[PDB]
Nucleic acid binder design. Structure first.
Ligand SMILES: [Mg+2]
Length: 214
DNA sequence: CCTGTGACAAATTGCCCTCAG
DNA sequence: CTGAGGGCAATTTGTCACAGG
């Protein structure tokens, strides 16, 4: 699929979006790059095509995901509103959106540091936290297509804005870690495992090690 | 403290059914 | 045929109360 290239800033940005909302942002960056005012646009047939949905169901996703963008902010470690104006359909099947102009810079490398991947790697993932992990792991991918990275549990909870109940490690393992690891080792070209780093009686970081299936 | 696990309810998800250009 | 709406049941995800170390 098209190859996405977002800055690590966003990749590490703290926010809470849905699958459909994230799928939507991918396309927003893409189209933006190969294009700023932020005034992007989305088509239902294309969307329905890329992600394999019926024209109808793709309409549900875009329409609901566009409302759920109201009031949501992005915190680049400076908080920013995703949109500055309500989305709107000028033509049947087409939606026009005004991404906060002030956000293009971040959505664009602006420097050597950045993250990239193809839509095929992340189009089969369902859990938005898993989409988050994958992208982060891709921030450490080497030309080989593998890597190893240690992440602070703290950082993960704060950036991925995980549910409060995942502050209790036994629940973070079950609902977040195990879940996202499997999802990736099944819906993406990545094959990964992990080791828990400890500080006596408590897990502090998570050591992720991954290698490309191909 | 810190773990793992069973219940439970709110969310999601892929389908299904209509209807107006 | 599209795509804008209205629903639905089966999973999932987010909480929490317990036993044990
Ligand atoms: Mg959907």
């Amino acid at each position: 699929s098209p190859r996405i290239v977002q800055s690590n800033d966003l990749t590490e940005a703290a926010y809470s979006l849905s699958r459909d909302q994230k799928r939507m942002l991918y396309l927003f960056v893409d189209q933006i790059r190969k294009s700023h005012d932020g005034i992007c646009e989305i088509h239902v047939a294309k969307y329905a095509e890329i992600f394999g949905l019926t024209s109808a169901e793709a309409s549900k996703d875009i329409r609901q995901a566009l409302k759920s963008f109201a009031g949501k902010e992005v915190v680049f470690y400076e908080s920013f509103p995703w949109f500055i104006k309500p989305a709107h359909s000028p033509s049947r099947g087409l939606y026009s959106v005004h991404i906060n102009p002030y956000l293009i810079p971040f959505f664009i490398g602006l420097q050597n540091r950045f993250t990239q991947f193809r839509l095929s790697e992340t189009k089969e993932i369902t859990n938005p936290y898993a989409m988050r992990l994958y992208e982060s792991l891709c921030q450490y991918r080497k030309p080989d297509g593998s890597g190893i990275v240690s992440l602070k549990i703290d950082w993960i909870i704060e950036r991925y804005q995980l549910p409060q109940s995942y502050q209790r490690m036994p629940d973070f393992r079950r609902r977040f870690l195990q879940v996202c690891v499997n999802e990736i080792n099944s819906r993406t070209p990545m094959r990964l495992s992990y080791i828990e780093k400890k500080k006596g009686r408590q897990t502090t970081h998570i050591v992720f090690s991954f290698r490309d299936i191909t």
